[PDB]
Write a protein that binds this ligand. Structure first.
Ligand SMILES: [K+]
Ligand SMILES: [K+]
Ligand SMILES: [K+]
Ligand SMILES: [K+]
Ligand SMILES: [K+]
Ligand SMILES: [K+]
Ligand SMILES: [K+]
Ligand SMILES: [K+]
Ligand SMILES: [K+]
Ligand SMILES: [K+]
Ligand SMILES: [K+]
Ligand SMILES: [K+]
Ligand SMILES: [K+]
Ligand SMILES: [K+]
Ligand SMILES: [K+]
Ligand SMILES: [K+]
Ligand SMILES: [K+]
Ligand SMILES: [K+]
Ligand SMILES: [K+]
Ligand SMILES: [K+]
Ligand SMILES: [K+]
Ligand SMILES: [K+]
Ligand SMILES: [K+]
Ligand SMILES: [K+]
Ligand SMILES: [K+]
Ligand SMILES: [K+]
Ligand SMILES: [Mg+2]
Ligand SMILES: [Mg+2]
Ligand SMILES: [Mg+2]
Ligand SMILES: [Mg+2]
Ligand SMILES: [Mg+2]
Ligand SMILES: [Mg+2]
Ligand SMILES: [Mg+2]
Ligand SMILES: [Mg+2]
Ligand SMILES: [Mg+2]
Ligand SMILES: [Mg+2]
Ligand SMILES: [Mg+2]
Ligand SMILES: [Mg+2]
Ligand SMILES: [Mg+2]
Ligand SMILES: [Mg+2]
Ligand SMILES: [Mg+2]
Ligand SMILES: [Mg+2]
Ligand SMILES: [Mg+2]
Ligand SMILES: [Mg+2]
Ligand SMILES: [Mg+2]
Ligand SMILES: [Mg+2]
Ligand SMILES: [Mg+2]
Ligand SMILES: [Mg+2]
Ligand SMILES: [Mg+2]
Ligand SMILES: [Mg+2]
Ligand SMILES: [Mg+2]
Ligand SMILES: [Mg+2]
Ligand SMILES: [Mg+2]
Ligand SMILES: [Mg+2]
Ligand SMILES: [Mg+2]
Ligand SMILES: [Mg+2]
Ligand SMILES: [Mg+2]
Ligand SMILES: [Mg+2]
Ligand SMILES: [Mg+2]
Ligand SMILES: [Mg+2]
Ligand SMILES: [Mg+2]
Ligand SMILES: [Mg+2]
Ligand SMILES: [Mg+2]
Ligand SMILES: [Zn+2]
Lengths: 122, 53, 114, 125, 206
RNA sequence: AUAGUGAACCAGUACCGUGAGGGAAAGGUGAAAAGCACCCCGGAAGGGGAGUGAAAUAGAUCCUGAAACCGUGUGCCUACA
RNA sequence: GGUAUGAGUAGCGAAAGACAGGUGAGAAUCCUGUCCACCGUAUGACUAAGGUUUCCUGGGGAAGGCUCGUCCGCCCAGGGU
RNA sequence: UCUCGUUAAGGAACUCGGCAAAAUGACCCCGUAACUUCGGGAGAAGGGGUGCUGACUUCGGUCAGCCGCAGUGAAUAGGCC
RNA sequence: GGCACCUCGAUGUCGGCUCGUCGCAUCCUGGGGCUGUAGUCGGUCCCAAGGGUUGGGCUGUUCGCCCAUUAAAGCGGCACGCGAGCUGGGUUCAGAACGUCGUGAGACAGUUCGGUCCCUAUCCGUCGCGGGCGUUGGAAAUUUGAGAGGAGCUGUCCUUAGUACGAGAGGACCGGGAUGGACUUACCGCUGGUGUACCAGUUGUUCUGCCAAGGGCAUUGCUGGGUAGCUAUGUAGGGAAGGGAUAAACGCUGAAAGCAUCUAAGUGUGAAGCCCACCUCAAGAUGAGAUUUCCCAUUUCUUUAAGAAAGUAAGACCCCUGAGAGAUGAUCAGGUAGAUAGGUUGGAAGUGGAAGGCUAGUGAUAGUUGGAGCGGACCAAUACUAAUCGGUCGAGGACUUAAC
């Protein structure tokens, strides 16, 4: 459950290390975003040599959350942290490598490039 | 908040319609015949359910 | 209770090995990426077992690529081919939520060989 | 559920232990309705432990029954003092060996003067 | 189609293809048609249904006489079902859970669980005032209204008794029918405390 | 007797104030106590009798005994306004 | 000055009591016992001031005591430095 | 309504304002910046250790072992920049 | 802005919070005409108020600028709605200071830091809940629906179709699906929360004489879990289809007026709107409705009385055990024609290996006896305890006129 002012780790090498949620997209009053949802975020901490830099407004897809997700088989998945991947407008990741495991729910949202790049898809 | 008008005798009496006691559940003791509260020990003879208790 | 128990006894699995929180299990999870179906092995420590009858579930925790990941399964889900007990751990409580705070060497559990 | 009886948990537990032991010692006491309806379960749970008669049962009962003198007799000497705990296991336990539950009865009596609180008598058998 | 049963409880069931779904167990020992109402006599068509046999001492001569035509024991719950084929029903006929089939779309009516006297926050989902910053306004129901009417408009929502209301949940799915046990499994949850009366009818919107 | 002195009465008192100082309320059984022996209910209070008295619904909070106010009985009326 | 209305309503002043036995017309509230609980750089022990009989003993239950009361720092009778 | 305890995910988005609360908190050890009136700033900051049982001691430790989620295991003792 | 008519024996002043409600000169969504409307986007006017109409940065602010969204992020009224509902940052009470003015005390043609927000609701009103009587014999159930309340929002994607349209670029109407946001009705099986008479660990001190095992106090001492119940952030469902009458608008046929013309007669199409449809309440709907079933015509006294009175019938209640119900009433489950509660016996959740032993070890401790012991509310049995014994109330049914 990610809302405005929620901060997430960056699960790629785009350059950003930490982002802050500006907006949960997808409706007028939507409060919360979960895995697979796209947010507008600001870069609060950036790797010095990276492409994405501190202060930049970016779009990003949530790929893991402490409040994870429920599947139709009655099973659940939860992660120890909240992480996002910075994406271009066509959902392609800005960076070249994804870090950490990724929820299988990205597939059904058609974030194929992230899913293919992730070291593990749980 | 304070009463805007004093309450009349009639209105006060009407309010106290339901301000009353009731005396419910008295019947004769099966041992001594004096009236008692049902399901209670008879305070006169000390019996209950036909037995001294 | 008895009526709900009778309605559900048919769907209780009988291939559940005896395991408790703190044991290491390999969960054979059936996954579907479309038409095809596949087994994805989720291995880790059972940190939780709650519920009764058909509603019983358990949680398995593993650390993959630096990130802790917990998976909760219905004990009797047909979507799990097999629950395999890898090792028996020595713990002192039913719920192992304290492992969430630990990492690496601190999170280790001593084997007991039941 | 369980009644709160106008006390805090620790205050209530103290009172239930006090009254429960009072019942074990006197076998008949006067209390309010509310206290009697709560004591009837605590006293009969103590009796169940006394019926078990084993050390583990004794020690569980010891955590609840007060350390009070239940009787003094000249059975052997003028210093044979029996505790509330010992009466539970020596006398009351064997007394109800063949009754399955229901070791107490409550008899409703008159209300208390200064309170109008509904009084009762709670006694064994 | 309709039937009266009691809410037993909630559980869950695995479907074919392995999906786990919550279900409410409704036990409906066969209902009995006690009376048939027609335009000729009552001005409207309906069947009067009895459910849950009741002990004789709990019944009345007026009540025992009423169920005498159907030739059954006294019934605790008696309700009417409208918009059915009356000719297909007659007094003394029994209605069983097998009237419904797995996959049928139903409407489920019951009496919501009582909650007693509740404030406008819980009863009406209103917003608290702030809990700090000098606030002395936490769980209060808000302004009663403007000055101009010199009164409060009706439907100013306040504290009061909550629950105990008839509520119908629409378009629920019948998941299973265990006739030997007189049990119907409904997907999802339905109103009412356990052991309360539940009315299952084929979905009106269907 | 809310008058007349603040004070008809144990008043410059009680009471208030550190103090200077401020400062009340409060008269009436009956001709005579003859102020109800004795009995009864009650722990008493208080009543009911029996007495005293011309009268006690003159019994001491005692002459007269207004009104507000409180209650009991009930002739008529009152639950679609 | 008297008496209403609001009312039989607000309030009954920071906290643990329980039961047995007794006393008595009457007791949650007085006495005794038992266990329980609270203070303990104190809620203990002294003492100055201030109060001025509140001390002790025996009686009492009108009023005072925020309930009750058989009890009291209250009332009555004796005493005490 | 007051006083108090616990809260999923988020973590100042609240608000005039982080008001209120939360967090810090003891002792030992490592370590500690700009600036300075050379005293200070400092308890800056930021870190580590703390229980139990044996062995061994230069008497402060050291080594070893043991248990728990957690060892100033409760209470009371800075939030910082 | 003008006036000075109510209020100066006081009608509390901005902004915000809580709660909304109304108007429509409509922001979005719905319908439509004209277009300098190819399409896609639009412009403009008409109809339309059913619902909807975001969160932040700065400022006391309103406003406004900005950031990021959105189908949209409408404008107004309600003492610039709402301080006996809240806040009190702003509005110069007393303090203090700056600029400025003054010889000055002081002051603003201005700023700055700091500064007590009382009230136990009597009446109407509002939201809930009972008692009384009525409804024309007395009862137990089931009902119709006068009337009323609730609900009413909308995105994106796929398909039709890269089709119609267009030189390209771009790119549909209508139709058919899927899936969301916000809101909302329920419920706790799931994920979680809580869980102060559930389980465990642990510190200090104190008590059970000591050891062992335990109790007390320390926020429930603290800590880790956690049942029932209550719950969201969890789960399920909902605003689906469809009629009828209409708005703007468009007709059809048609004359007045040989033509033309939607109108005059006649007749049709047409909106998220109206009335239904969907949900809930509902005959105190005094207009008091209907249906099924039960009791059945008593006694006495007065009297032609719709008389008074007395036992009762069906039935209901008192009282008592309770809960799924609950402030109290009430509701519902029961009262031995008995499982209603307690206990008891089995279970379960939950905790996570009791005590007492034994084995190993110098010891702390470990293993074992043994998934043990404990186990509020959950489940199932069981009359062991308590629902004893009883009492109260409660019909005998008017008249007129149709018909039969
Ligand atoms: K008796
Ligand atoms: K006289
Ligand atoms: K009168
Ligand atoms: K008065
Ligand atoms: K009064
Ligand atoms: K005395
Ligand atoms: K917020
Ligand atoms: K510093
Ligand atoms: K440690
Ligand atoms: K400190
Ligand atoms: K004025
Ligand atoms: K408005
Ligand atoms: K247009
Ligand atoms: K509208
Ligand atoms: K702001
Ligand atoms: K501000
Ligand atoms: K005004
Ligand atoms: K105010
Ligand atoms: K006002
Ligand atoms: K009024
Ligand atoms: K201890
Ligand atoms: K203690
Ligand atoms: K919990
Ligand atoms: K009626
Ligand atoms: K053991
Ligand atoms: K167990
Ligand atoms: Mg379990
Ligand atoms: Mg305590
Ligand atoms: Mg005792
Ligand atoms: Mg809010
Ligand atoms: Mg407050
Ligand atoms: Mg008006
Ligand atoms: Mg004078
Ligand atoms: Mg005079
Ligand atoms: Mg004078
Ligand atoms: Mg006279
Ligand atoms: Mg006189
Ligand atoms: Mg009328
Ligand atoms: Mg009338
Ligand atoms: Mg009042
Ligand atoms: Mg007091
Ligand atoms: Mg202490
Ligand atoms: Mg101290
Ligand atoms: Mg004395
Ligand atoms: Mg004395
Ligand atoms: Mg008194
Ligand atoms: Mg939280
Ligand atoms: Mg958390
Ligand atoms: Mg802010
Ligand atoms: Mg804000
Ligand atoms: Mg603060
Ligand atoms: Mg500590
Ligand atoms: Mg003039
Ligand atoms: Mg005035
Ligand atoms: Mg218009
Ligand atoms: Mg106001
Ligand atoms: Mg000057
Ligand atoms: Mg000016
Ligand atoms: Mg200040
Ligand atoms: Mg739940
Ligand atoms: Mg459950
Ligand atoms: Mg010891
Ligand atoms: Mg049962
Ligand atoms: Zn008797």
């Amino acid at each position: 459950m990610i809302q405005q002012e929620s901060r997430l780790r960056v699960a790629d090498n785009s350059g950003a290390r930490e982002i802050l949620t500006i907006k949960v997209l997808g409706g007028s009053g939507r409060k919360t975003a979960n895995i697979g949802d796209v947010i507008v975020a600001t870069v609060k901490q950036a790797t010095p040599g990276g492409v994405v830099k501190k202060g930049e407004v970016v779009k990003a897809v949530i790929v893991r959350t402490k409040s994870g997700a429920r599947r139709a088989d009655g099973s659940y998945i939860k992660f120890d942290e909240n992480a996002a991947v910075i994406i271009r407008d066509d959902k392609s990741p800005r960076g070249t490598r994804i870090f950490g495991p990724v929820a299988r729910e990205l597939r059904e949202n058609n974030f194929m490039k992230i899913v293919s790049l992730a070291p593990e898809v749980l | 908040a304070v009463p805007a008008r004093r309450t009349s005798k009639a209105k006060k009496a009407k309010r106290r319609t339901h301000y009353k006691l009731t005396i419910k559940g008295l019947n004769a003791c099966s041992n001594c015949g004096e009236m008692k509260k049902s399901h209670h020990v008879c305070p006169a003879c000390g019996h209950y359910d036909g037995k001294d208790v | 209770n008895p009526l709900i128990q009778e309605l559900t006894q048919e769907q209780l699995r009988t291939d559940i090995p005896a395991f408790r929180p703190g044991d290491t299990v390999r969960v054979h999870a059936k996954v579907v990426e479309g038409t095809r179906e596949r087994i994805q092995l989720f291995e880790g420590v059972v940190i939780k077992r709650r519920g009764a009858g058909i509603s019983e579930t358990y949680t398995v925790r593993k650390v993959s690529n630096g990130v802790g990941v917990e998976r909760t399964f219905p004990l009797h889900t047909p979507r799990v081919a097999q629950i395999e007990v890898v090792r028996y751990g020595k713990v002192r409580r039913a719920k192992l939520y304290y492992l969430r705070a630990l990492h690496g060497k601190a999170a280790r559990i001593k084997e007991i060989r039941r | 559920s369980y009644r709160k009886l106008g006390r805090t948990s620790s205050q209530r537990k103290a009172m239930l232990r006090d009254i429960t032991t009072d019942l074990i010692i006197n076998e008949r006491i006067v209390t309010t309705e509310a206290r009697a309806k709560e004591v009837r379960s605590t006293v009969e749970k103590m009796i169940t432990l006394g019926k078990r008669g084993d050390l583990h049962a004794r020690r569980q009962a010891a955590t609840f029954v007060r350390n009070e003198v239940a009787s003094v007799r000249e059975e052997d000497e003028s210093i044979v003092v029996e505790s509330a705990l010992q009466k539970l296991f020596n006398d009351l336990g064997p007394r109800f060996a063949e009754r399955q539950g229901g070791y107490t009865r409550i008899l409703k009596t008159e209300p208390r003067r200064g309170d109008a609180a509904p009084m009762v008598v709670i006694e064994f058998v | 189609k309709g039937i009266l049963g009691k809410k037993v409880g909630m559980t869950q069931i695995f479907t074919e293809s392995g999906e786990l779904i919550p279900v409410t167990v409704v036990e409906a020992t066969p209902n009995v048609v006690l009376q048939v109402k027609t335009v000729e006599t009552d001005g409207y068509e309906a069947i009067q249904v009895g459910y849950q046999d009741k002990r004789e001492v709990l019944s009345n001569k007026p009540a025992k006489g009423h169920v005498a035509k159907a030739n059954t024991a006294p019934k605790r719950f008696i309700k009417e079902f409208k918009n059915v084929e009356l000719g297909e029903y007659e007094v003394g006929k029994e209605i069983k859970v097998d009237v419904f089939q797995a996959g049928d779309v139903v409407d489920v009516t019951g009496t919501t669980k009582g909650k007693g006297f509740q404030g406008a926050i819980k009863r009406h989902g209103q917003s608290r005032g702030p809990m700090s910053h000098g606030s002395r306004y936490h769980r209060r129901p808000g302004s009663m209204g403007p000055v101009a009417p010199n009164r409060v408009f009706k439907n100013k929502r306040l504290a009061g008794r909550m629950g105990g209301d008839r509520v119908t949940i629409q378009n629920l799915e019948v998941v299973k029918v265990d006739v030997e046990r007189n049990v119907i499994l409904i997907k999802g949850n339905i109103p009412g405390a356990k052991k309360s009366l539940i009315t299952i009818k084929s979905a009106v919107k269907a």
